[PDB]
Symmetry: D3
Subunit: 158 residues, 6 copies
């Protein structure tokens, strides 16, 4: 069965990769969906983020990476996908997640949003933390794949 | 007794209408006050928002709609109003509401901020949700009055 | 207009007294209702609590003190009261309040639960904290009326 | 694929039944597991709760109801089940759920705890609310299956 | 400078040991104070707990282990200690810690309660979790010192 | 022992001054570090903020005021400081403080971030609140030092 893992992935972290790998143990097919969050000004374009994720996930079976500019549930409806996966961390805004899950279900009544728990080691990181630290030249090697560390380093020069 | 229900109402949703109606069961006179939130960029002007609300509330007795550009407690002091009504949702920033209630009371010692609980159906909606969904062409009809759905549709063109 | 301010008041604190005083600015008649909480083992009997509160509020106009053993909304329906007042503190279980308000409104549709915010000075106290400190002989004089400090002291000799 | 939906179910509510029906959209087999919570004193025995749930879910395909007295992950390991399903409400202790998910995953590395969101209607109810209202003679009919309203009625005599 | 690390320590976990080690990098003298929490029924007596802690910390310099049955601030006042150290975890009741810090500062105005953050790995563990798991015969080896795993095993036979 | 109290101090409030005074009873040397928060647009420059704080703390022994534009831990590493002090309020985003403490300790393994509790009177105030109220011409006298009230008044003209 198919699921979508939607997110800004700006950039993708090792926490995200963990959720992807784990989600694949429940859903045979996973779409990692780089989707526009209108409440964020992103560092990387949607396509830059897609290419990064593809490099990073390159030898996982069962995973496809895509981008979406519109209403999330329209992507799912169009492709006949009825499951959304999201990760929950200690630093997650829980009411935000609930609000969106409930809103999405109202817009798409067949939808199920399924949450996995971040492991302890990734429960307090975020893309935002990663970018902030990299932008001041800190080491983010333990939080992101090497592809992403390179990409961040370049963007901090450009 | 008179109370002010202050908010961005950008736009007013069914959750807001519910708090208005319920607040009127306690306070015989309610001022719905469209007030500037300096931490928000608003979709509709203060006056567009007043007009929607007036259309929406248009046969409710006991309600007046107004706008205010300054310090909220100044409106209440000038009009002799000593009660502020606000709604509490599952998705409400509780510390923000407390902070603001306490700051307002510091500024205006006779003030009481009184909170009502949003019903379950409205406890996870907000104007922000409504606008985001409308802006991507989703149906917001379950969350807003039809006057507002119309207004949002126009604004999105 | 009539309102009920229901609670364990076990014992009543200066924080409760503040909410009573403030609620009386909005509601002409206030019933302070000593109500059984089935999730607590109380220190004082319902009647001991009623008596302390009466001593403590003795010269406030507009306040009546009463006790109730049953379903809270039944007290209100019986007496034609449609407003419940509760205080909100930094240490309040917000979800429990919200749950109870919404349950109470499902049981009694005309009901409105209204919340006042505890002042900063009382926003981190509770009857529980008071009892625990008095139990170990600490001074609770800044948190409770003198009558209550007295009653606590006696109870911790018994 | 099999999952276990573990809980006190003391008693089962319409919120739990909703999660069960929805989980069955994802998992082909669901074990509803009446499991001992050592931080709770139950109203009904584990076996009373099992019988109630079996009455309630009687014509749902794909569900089994069972009881477990020990460590949750031991039941899953024993039966080769590697998914746990839980529900998330507005009134859920989030940090408790995370703790327990993380602890269970430590104890059983192949485990995944999967969370579904309770609908708005069921996001502010709990078994504990139901029992407290029932015990004071309040109507809990909109929160529990009729079977459970009956059982609560009897127990309170 | 002297500090007290007060707690139930029922039993001491690796999370507590981490806080102790780290607090010693700031405070040259640390008193680990096994103190009675009246809102808990403890598994081990205060003396059992002291003994376990002493076994566990046996070759740490700068640490003393003690017990206290009364009001915490009375121990501190008696011994001229003005700093209390507590740990903060993702599963900490933050309002309970604040309440108690503020209450303690009210009862002893010179006191400062200082909080350290638990590491990610210990941020979701508690003595309570440990005891629940052990009680049902689960491995708590990664969460407690071996002395404690042994003590827990014995207690679960007794 | 030396500690850094880092913050935007935009502007410094009486709550910050209280944490400074109290931190000085534990740490014989305190550096108040005006540091860039990249998630905020500041009202005052780093140097305006440094100068305010210096006026405000002028007769406190043991305190130095400084500014830093980069990674916070780099300031500490450079100066051999291994303690960071922060304040906890009712209105503090706890998860954010935790996240940053843990991240900082990852980047600088000798570091301890140590938290003091804001007194009740300061537990619901913030520089943001102050700015918002001052902006609308409200009295912020009870929340900031008179030097800061003045500075805010100027800025608003
Ligand atoms: C990108 C995301 C999925 C949120 O993910 P994020 O937390 O990784 O930013 C986004 O907010 C989203 O859903 N965008 C599309 C708009 C939409 O479908 N719904 C918003 C109303 S629920
Ligand atoms: C509009 C509102 C009442 C907030 O309502 P909102 O949550 O609907 O945005 C606003 O923040 C407000 O009070 N605005 C300007 C006046 C003021 O006094 N602000 C300081 C509050 S301490
Ligand atoms: C005593 C109290 C008011 C709670 O107040 P407390 O927080 O002061 O203990 C009580 O829990 C209550 O409302 N009712 C007792 C019985 C009842 O009505 N229970 C169901 C409420 S949904
Ligand atoms: C605690 C509970 C009964 C279920 O919780 P519920 O009461 O929230 O429905 C849970 O299912 C459980 O696991 N009980 C058995 C003991 C166990 O495995 N404990 C360690 C959990 S980390
Ligand atoms: C031991 C502890 C610090 C709590 O520690 P714990 O949270 O590890 O159980 C305890 O509750 C305590 O202080 N006990 C004695 C009673 C007291 O002095 N104060 C509570 C009044 S603020
Ligand atoms: C960002 C901030 C100034 C926050 O302080 P504030 O809460 O007073 O704004 C913080 O003190 C800090 O660390 N800033 C510098 C940038 C940095 O080092 N960021 C990585 C945070 S892990």
């Amino acid at each position: 069965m198919k699921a979508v893992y939607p997110g800004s992935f700006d950039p993708i972290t090792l926490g995200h990769v963990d959720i992807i790998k784990r989600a694949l143990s429940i859903f045979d097919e996973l779409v990692v969906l780089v989707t526009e969050n209108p409440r964020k000004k992103c560092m990387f374009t949607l396509e830059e983020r897609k290419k990064l994720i593809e490099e990073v996930l390159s030898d996982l079976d069962g995973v496809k990476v895509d981008v979406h500019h519109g209403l999330l549930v329209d992507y799912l409806k169009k492709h006949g996908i009825k499951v959304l996966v999201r990760g929950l961390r200690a630093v997650t805004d829980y009411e935000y997640e609930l609000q969106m899950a409930l809103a999405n279900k109202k817009l798409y009544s067949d939808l199920e949003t399924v949450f996995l728990i971040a492991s302890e080691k990734f429960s307090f990181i975020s893309s935002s933390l990663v970018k902030e630290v990299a932008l001041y030249g800190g080491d983010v090697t333990e939080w992101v794949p090497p592809e992403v560390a390179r990409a961040l380093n370049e963007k901090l020069k450009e």
